[PDB]
């Protein structure tokens, strides 16, 4: 007899309520105020051109059929009330497979302020699509987007807006930084109108500025390719008469160079254009191949030392240093 007062209020709101109609269907345009709390920015798969994000997708609108007078103002209600009322059909434009978490109860809440203001948050993991242009691999930077808007309601019915200021309407938690390869720099939001065959919809887009950390590929591709060149350029310091010895240098360095040429592109997609790493590999391929034809030159020609070996001892280490000085200068800036 002390909790039946709140039982009367909840049945009073849903009596005569039609949840198939947006509020102000014949009067106004339903403004949906939205803000995103990112609990953990998950990993970026650069093979699928996708990324995973865990959000607290908050929404807010005003319904004039849910006014009430009671003891308390905020009604921190349960989850199953939300399916009994009107909710906007917000979907992600570039989502691929997003999951609403259901353990143990569904991870949604619903607060009904006594003037008719609703707050409807949910916990979603979103596997959105991030189109990439890997022409500066691995020193590239990306702007991974996240576009969302209504599905069945046009811009004359449902419009979207941010709750707080657009600078601080997408908040990233400090502890959630599940990127292991990329590095999150900042977030930028925007809003516009899209055009479709059915009509004009309001779309909300939040870009994620990412920058790849080079340090994995230094100790995986760059340093072993550099040390292969030094392994290939030690052949100029031997004698001219070590034909089986120098041909081990001339074959095993170029045989191990094409293995790293294959194995550096396995995690990459099958893109048509050549990446910036492949230009470093091909010049390093060209430096270890010109060392092999250097030995084939001196083998064709009391045996004194050669002018070819006395010049390639100085030129080939120097000319690799000129390339390495200009490659890291023009792709790190």
């Amino acid at each position, epitope marked *: 007899d002390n909790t039946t007062v709140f039982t009367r209020i909840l049945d009073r709101l849903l009596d005569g309520y039609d949840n198939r109609l947006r509020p102000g269907l014949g009067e106004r345009v339903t403004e949906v105020k939205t803000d995103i709390f990112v609990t953990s920015f998950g990993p970026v798969s650069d093979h699928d051109m996708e990324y995973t994000i865990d959000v607290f997708f908050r929404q807010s609108w*005003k319904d004039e059929r849910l006014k009430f007078k009671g003891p308390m103002t905020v009604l921190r209600l349960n989850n199953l009330m939300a399916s009994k009322i009107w909710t906007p059909d917000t979907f992600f434009h570039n989502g691929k497979k997003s999951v609403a978490h259901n353990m143990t109860m569904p991870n949604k809440l619903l607060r009904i302020t006594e*003037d008719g203001t609703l707050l409807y948050t949910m916990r979603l993991t979103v596997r959105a699509e991030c189109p990439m242009h890997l022409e500066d691999f691995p020193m590239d930077a990306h702007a991974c987007p996240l576009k969302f808007g209504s599905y069945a309601y046009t811009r004359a019915e449902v*419009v979207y*807006e941010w709750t707080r*200021e*657009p*600078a601080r309407s997408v908040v990233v938690a400090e502890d959630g930084s599940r990127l292991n390869q990329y590095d999150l720099l900042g977030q930028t939001v*925007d809003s*516009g109108i899209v055009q479709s065959s059915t009509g004009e919809y309001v779309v909300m887009t939040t870009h994620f500025h990412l920058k790849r950390k080079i340090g994995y590929f230094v100790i995986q591709t760059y340093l072993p390719c550099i040390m292969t060149v030094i392994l290939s350029q030690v052949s100029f310091w031997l004698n001219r008469e070590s034909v089986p010895a120098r041909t081990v240098f001339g074959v095993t360095t170029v045989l191990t160079m094409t293995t790293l040429s294959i194995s550096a592109r396995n995690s990459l997609p099958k893109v048509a254009y050549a990446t910036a790493m492949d230009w470093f590999i091909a010049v390093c391929y060209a430096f270890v191949f010109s060392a092999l034809i250097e030995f084939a030159t001196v083998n064709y020609f009391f045996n004194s030392v050669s002018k070819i070996d006395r010049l390639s001892r100085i030129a080939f280490p120097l000319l690799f240093g000129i390339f390495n000085l200009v490659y890291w200068a023009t792709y790190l800036n």
Partner: antibody
Amino acid sequence: VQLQQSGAELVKPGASVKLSCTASGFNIKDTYMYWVKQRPEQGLEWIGRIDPANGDTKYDPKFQGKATITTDTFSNTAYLQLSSLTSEDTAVYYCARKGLRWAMDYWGQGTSVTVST
Amino acid sequence: NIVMTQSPKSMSMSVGERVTLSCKASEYVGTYVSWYQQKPEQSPKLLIYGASNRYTGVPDRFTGSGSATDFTLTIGSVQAEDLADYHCGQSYSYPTFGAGTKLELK
């Protein structure tokens, strides 16, 4: 719809002044309240903002500790509070609300303060 | 903080030709850039909310252009009722304003 402000006043330097912005046709709890400083022959200057749902307040870094805003939902009016006013701040104060795309669609008529002898 | 630079300070053209206002931001503001006019000794009104999105009531000769940094306000034909200075505000952060841009008629 219609935004109303009180009339102009004459104050001495170093005193305190109260200025009001009455809103009609719409409640304050769902839209922000913006106040902006308009000097003569000069551009605008935003000074602060109000979220009346929770009483949140954020000021301009220049006007920190200079102005204070209280808001009454029942009176449908927001209030200025200029504690330490000097003779340099002789201008007109305008009232505003948040528009469709965070613009300021509806503006008050403006109240001019005059700090002189 | 965000600063908005409105160029030029003033101009003077006759009735019924092309005028191009300018407003450039310090850093990235996406679309939330507002245009306000100020008729002398009245209240400001709103011309374009957002970038390139006309408000209701103003004529169709007013138009805008949006980008990441630079924003242009264009009137196809200057009329006799446009004696005001135009202010360029922003709303991606806490709002700031430019210095305005006066105009005069012969």
